[PDB]
Subunit: 66 residues, 6 copies
RNA sequence: AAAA
């Protein structure tokens, strides 16, 4: 079992870096990666919203993550 | 393992109003009645079946315990 | 993890013959009568019998309540 | 028991014109020459291969038996 | 059976130029150099990998037999 | 029969060639393919962005 | 790249 998806994400979760999730419709949902599974990433901010990964273009971190 | 069954099942028991933004930027604000592997059945004036393959984000209207 | 609300909902909109609206991810309204559905398409019947693709449907909204 | 292969296998068996609308709001009008699982070869002035994942609804030009 | 790989393998052996329309409505006009099950490598000025999950209709520039 | 998605990216990385990444939104993400997993390409420019393959339309390398 |  290997990948770059969980690693990159569980990182911006642990070191809690502010992230910007871009949607395939051109919407910028910016928050913090509380958790994620195989279909959704719960981006938390004022309210915790469940984001389906099938609408995510790119997730750009606000600061590099070790 | 799953974070969707808990999130949705939790917006059902608690009867917390939701918004369900669509991949077209369409806001569907109702209440989660139930859901399966491919849809959720939001309830408002008339219950609707929203395909998850057309759902961008589902922001609750209030945090939830 | 073991239930299919998709076959009910649409089947109940046929046995009761309740008019559905159909919404497309492009923002299109396809209003008609659920004649039959498989695992990928639902055949809406209005002036002609058209095979709509489920992969292009955002929401389907009955025009009045429905029974069970 | 699918209605996608029969419906198409009958809009080709009685050689009926169809519209093969696209999810981009595009209408591809022609005649169904063949299909498989991911494509239907609509042969109009040109023989093009339309990916079913880009098709919203396929509406016949007239009723088909 | 398949109606996809063949059409493409014949749009390669004959070396017909092709237009590949994207779900966005973009026209990538080049020549089909190769394909797997998820991408089709179209080479015009520089070989570009085009994902088939973003292709609507692939119309040839001339009949392919 | 044989994968062409990895060998293409594994060769656009080993040769450190700039690459264009058109998206299904008509977006153009220019950068360098640092790594690639089944669902994602880790294109980098100023910060390492994770682009989802299911949001990419075409990927035109800058040079052969 | 319309926190819509």
């Amino acid at each position: 079992g290997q990948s770059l998806q969980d690693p990159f994400l569980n990182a911006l979760r642990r070191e809690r870096v502010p992230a910007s999730i871009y949607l395939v419709n051109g919407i910028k949902l910016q928050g913090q990666i509380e958790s994620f599974d195989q279909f959704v990433i719960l981006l938390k901010n004022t309210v915790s919203q469940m984001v389906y990964k099938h609408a995510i273009s790119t997730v750009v971190p606000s600061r590099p993550v070790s």
